[PDB]
Amino acid sequence: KENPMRELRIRKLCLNICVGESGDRLTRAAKVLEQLTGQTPVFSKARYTVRSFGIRRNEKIAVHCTVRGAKAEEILEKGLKVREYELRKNNFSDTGNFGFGIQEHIDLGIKYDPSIGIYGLDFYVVLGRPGFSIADKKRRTGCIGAKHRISKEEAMRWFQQKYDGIILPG
RNA sequence: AGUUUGACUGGGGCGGUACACCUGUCAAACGGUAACGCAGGUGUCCUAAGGCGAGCUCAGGGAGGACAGAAACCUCCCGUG
Numbered sequence: 001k002e003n004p005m006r007e008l009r010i011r012k013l014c015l016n017i018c019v020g021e022s023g024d025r026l027t028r029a030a031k032v033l034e035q036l037t038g039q040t041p042v043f044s045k046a047r048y049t050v051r052s053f054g055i056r057r058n059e060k061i062a063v064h065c066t067v068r069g070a071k072a073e074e075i076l077e078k079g080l081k082v083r084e085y086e087l088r089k090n091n092f093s094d095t096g097n098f099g100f101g102i103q104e105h106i107d108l109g110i111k112y113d114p115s116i117g118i119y120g121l122d123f124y125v126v127l128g129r130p131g132f133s134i135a136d137k138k139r140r141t142g143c144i145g146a147k148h149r150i151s152k153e154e155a156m157r158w159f160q161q162k163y164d165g166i167i168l169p170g
Numbered sequence: 171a172g173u174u175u176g177a178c179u180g181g182g183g184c185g186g187u188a189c190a191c192c193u194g195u196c197a198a199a200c201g202g203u204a205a206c207g208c209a210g211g212u213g214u215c216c217u218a219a220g221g222c223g224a225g226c227u228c229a230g231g232g233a234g235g236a237c238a239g240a241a242a243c244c245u246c247c248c249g250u251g
């Protein structure tokens with residue numbers, strides 16, 4: 001009934017880890033993303049100086065990576081397994097894309113190394129349909145259109161159908 | 171001993187600089203147009219903040235995401251500036 005070009009699918013998984021300050025902590029956090037994603041992470045500087053958070057401007061504060069393709073799908077199932085395939089409905093967003101956070105990186109895949117820290121990580125998957133790339137395109141870029149957009153309700157079905165997930169009322 | 175001891179100025183002095191400049195206004199829809207008219211600014215700064223090319227999009231807001239809270243970072247959407 002539905003067109004094959006309307007099928008929902010994962011655009012990117014967008015792992016992010018934010019630490020307080022630049023230092024060995026950030027470098028070891030970068031290795032944490034590198035081992036999980038098999039991919040070189042990128043550091044993010046602080047936009048402003050905040051004395052309360054003890055961060056200075058243009059200081060490396062966080063490390064983040066974007067994972068696409070089958071690699072993203074395999075990372076998502078590990079993280080969902082940490083949350084026992086149970087996502088709260090507030091986590092799903094109005095734009096049609098959801099995210100969850102994992103407190104401990106060590107539990108899934110990677111053995112703890114004494115050099116490596118105890119860092120957790122942040123998941124935010126972006127859900128898309130075929131043809132969403134027209135917005136990114138340089139030539140003749142355009143908006144996707146209302147019917148082709150993904151709603152919060154559609155994302156919730158996708159989790160409930162693909163991962164037999166449970167959306168708790170929270 | 172010789173000489174000098176600025177100017178403008180609702181008298182002079184004191185105070186200010188309207189004494190060389192720049193923006194808006196006055197200013198009466200070309201331009202020009204005065205008051206010690208009004209609101210301000212200048213004696214600098216920059217091997218890049220100069221010159222090309224390329225690639226991006228900004229302020230702000232909404233919705234999401236471990237520690238994270240009104241603000242740390244990540245993601246999507248709106249966004250004529």
Ligand SMILES: [K+]
Nearest residue numbers: 196197198199
């Ligand atoms: K005029």
Ligand SMILES: [Mg+2]
Nearest residue numbers: 177178179182
């Ligand atoms: Mg005189």
Ligand SMILES: [Mg+2]
Nearest residue numbers: 197198199200
């Ligand atoms: Mg005239």
Ligand SMILES: [Mg+2]
Nearest residue numbers: 197199200201
């Ligand atoms: Mg005129």
Ligand SMILES: [Mg+2]
Nearest residue numbers: 223224225226
């Ligand atoms: Mg250009």
